[PDB]
């Protein structure tokens, strides 16, 4: 079981009700084939996205290296006009560039003022929103954000997770995506919503021994493919080609539970974040009992938590 | 996963304090001067000197209550303790136990000085700790083949075997996980051939092991689990003492068993943080519980 490699189930012809009432409550990743996405899927050539989306300047990642690394931040931020960015991500070599002729590009769309606006494709790319029919797989009152996702081929984003449920729509290009159950957290060596294990295919088990028990689900997304990701599910994407992605986040929970400053979808539901503050407190009172004693009692706690609150 | 506890002869008062004690590991100390006690505390001697003072007699045991509190006159207690004893409250092969406790059990600690003055004069506790850190002295009479369940104490302990053999096995505090701890007692009664059925984890527990001969002293650093099994009849005494600044402990504790106040409270607020988490759907609750124990492990462990 541990360290296994599963396929993410692929279903074609899934209905609204069957997704919403049968597949969704199942809380597992799943890919849907053949959904009517709108013509976006035959229109969004690079020439078109440049023309139609053009020149709305966006915040962008530039990396001189396929495997992007936040532990060493080996990439830099920059801005670019939408068309430019597109044209650049579809390239392999670059005449003009921010760091090297082979640097790779990564757009994760953001609301006009990232401080108070979630990203909304409808709001910020009105024409482009035109070509794409969001699958109606969730109550509208729970909509949260809609995000563009365009990357150079060979670009490896790192393993993270979000607090919202999420429909990732591969419109153009092939995407590889491996996923980890939320319960695989212990194995993932996380700093925040990120994992330190960059090379998942060929892991340095000297530094990340526990990564071994990690049971990975894998899937590759062709154009037209849609993938559902339950909240808290870890995921790692690699643009195998050039492609254009749109994701839709939405609330699985009462809007009341979420943190309102969070426009990205990382921040922990208030209850959890509060809990974490409480905990940091205990870790402090206990803290300056001698290490010997702290330790014994940290261990009691952990076992206790595992028993009252694990399921 | 089965070690011996080091035995050491000729360890100085100093050498121990300075270089051994701070190792925080269990040691048995051979050939300390305990006084005449080790010499004269015979069933017959004991019986005489002790007197007829009524004592709290308990009668392989189960903590499931397969024991029973009782009370007898000391001399008769020892005398039976050495016995199949004719007079019994439960059975002919009644097993007899004794763990000393001060006048008011809820108020005061046990203390050999206060409660066995004559007998006290026979034994010199080893000077391995300051008088200010003294916490209690206890008289331990048990009958042969009596199996007292596994527990830990919060005070450092000097178990002194004065008379008769006694086995004892121990476990790293950290082996808390494998012990299935119900408070300060562990669920696995028969330590030798454990029902791995009920408790699969007791296996992963490295168990240290020693045998006390009359005169031997076992140091048990606070937090070490130990299981004591009187092979022959005999009397032992143990002394608890505060390893931490006296304030750190629970005032209500007359046993040296209650958690340091810092622990007791931290676990209390912990129970709070669980009450908030609890209100999210189980699966979210779950995920963040795990993120909590990751956090505790990284920050507080070793
Ligand atoms: Mg994401």
Closest CA to A173 of A149, A199, A156, A198: A149
Cβ–Cβ below 8 Å for A185 and B291: yes
Closest CA to B240 of B257, B264, B259: B257
CA of A29 to the centre of ligand 1 (A): 13
Report CA Rg, chain A. 21
Cβ–Cβ below 8 Å for A272 and B273: no
C-alpha A135/C-alpha A27 separation (Å) is: 18
- Chain B hits for A274, CB-CB cut-off 8 Å, are 276
CB atoms within 10 A of CB A44: 24
Resolution in Å equals: 2.5
DSSP state of B4: B
DSSP state of B269: H
The tokens describing B222, both together, are 């606070």
Q: Are B59 and B142 in contact (CB under 8 A)?
A: no
Domains of chain B: 1-254 (2.60.120.650), 255-302 (6.10.140.1470)
Long-range Cβ contacts of B276-282 (<8 Å, 24+ apart): B276/A271, B276/A274, B276/A275, B276/A278, B277/A271, B277/A272, B277/A275, B277/A309, B278/A309, B279/A271, B280/A253, B280/A257, B280/A269, B280/A271, B280/A272, B281/A253, B282/A311
- Chain B hits for A231, CB-CB cut-off 8 Å, are 284
φ, ψ at B75 (rounded to 5°):
-55, -40
β-strands B225-230, A165-170 pairing = unpaired
C-alpha A141/C-alpha A251 separation (Å) is: 9
- Chain B hits for A183, CB-CB cut-off 8 Å, are 286-287, 290
- Please indicate if the annotation marks B157 as binding a ligand: yes
- Please indicate if the annotation marks B198 as binding a ligand: no
The tokens describing A6, both together, are 């599963």
C-alpha A214/C-alpha A235 separation (Å) is: 12
| Experimental approach taken | X-ray
The tokens describing B13, both together, are 């008062």
List the beta bridge partners of residue A151: A106, A243
C-alpha B208/C-alpha B222 separation (Å) is: 15
What angle is formed at CA B279 by the lines to CA B287 and CA A275, rounded to 5 degrees? 60
Chain B closest-CA separation from residue A151 CA (Å): 30
CA of B69 to the centre of ligand 1 (A): 63
- The pocket of ion ligand 1, defined by CB under 5 A, consists of A 162
C-alpha A308/C-alpha B87 separation (Å) is: 48
- Please indicate if the annotation marks A166 as binding a ligand: yes
Any residues with CB less than 8 A from the CB of B106 and at least 6 apart, and which? B254
- Chain A hits for B222, CB-CB cut-off 8 Å, are 292-293
Any residues with CB less than 8 A from the CB of A79 and at least 6 apart, and which? A57, A58, A59, A60
- Out of A27, A186, A300, the one facing B294 most closely (by C-beta) is A186
CB atoms within 10 A of CB A127: 10
Any residues with CB less than 8 A from the CB of B161 and at least 6 apart, and which? B212, B213, B214, B215, B216, B217, B218, B234, B236
C-alpha A147/C-alpha A160 separation (Å) is: 16
């Amino acid at each position: 079981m541990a360290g296994q490699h599963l396929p993410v189930p692929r279903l074609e012809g899934v209905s609204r009700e069957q997704f919403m009432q049968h597949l969704y409550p199942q809380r597992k990743p799943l890919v849907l084939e053949g959904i009517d996405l709108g013509p976006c899927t035959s229109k969004w050539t690079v020439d078109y996205l440049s023309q139609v989306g053009g020149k709305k300047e966006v915040k962008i990642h530039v990396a001189a290296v396929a495997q992007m690394d936040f532990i060493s931040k080996n990439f830099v931020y920059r801005t670019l006009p939408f068309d430019q960015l597109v044209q650049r991500a579809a390239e392999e070599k670059h005449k003009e560039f921010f760091v090297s002729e082979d640097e790779k590009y990564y757009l994760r769309s953001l609301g006009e003022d990232p401080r108070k606006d979630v990203a909304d494709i409808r709001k910020q790319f009105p024409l482009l929103k035109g070509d794409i029919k969001f699958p109606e797989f969730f109550k509208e009152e729970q909509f949260f954000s809609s995000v563009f996702r365009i990357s150079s081929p060979g670009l490896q984003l790192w393993t993270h997770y979000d607090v919202m449920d999420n429909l990732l729509i591969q419109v153009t290009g092939k995407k590889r995506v491996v996923l980890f159950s939320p319960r695989d957290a212990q194995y993932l060596y996380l700093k925040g919503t990120k994992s330190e294990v960059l090379n998942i295919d060929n892991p340095d088990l000297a530094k990340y021994p526990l990564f071994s028990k990690a049971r990975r689900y894998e899937c590759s997304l062709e154009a037209g493919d849609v993938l559902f990701i339950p909240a808290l599910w870890f995921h790692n994407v690699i643009s195998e080609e050039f492609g254009v992605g749109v994701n839709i986040f939405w609330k699985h929970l009462p809007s009341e539970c979420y943190d309102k400053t969070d426009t990205y979808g990382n921040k922990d539901p208030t209850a959890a974040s509060r809990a974490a503050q409480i905990l940091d407190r205990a870790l402090k009172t206990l803290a300056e009992l001698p290490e010997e004693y702290r330790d014994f009692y940290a261990r009691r706690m952990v076992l206790h938590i595992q028993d009252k609150a694990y399921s």
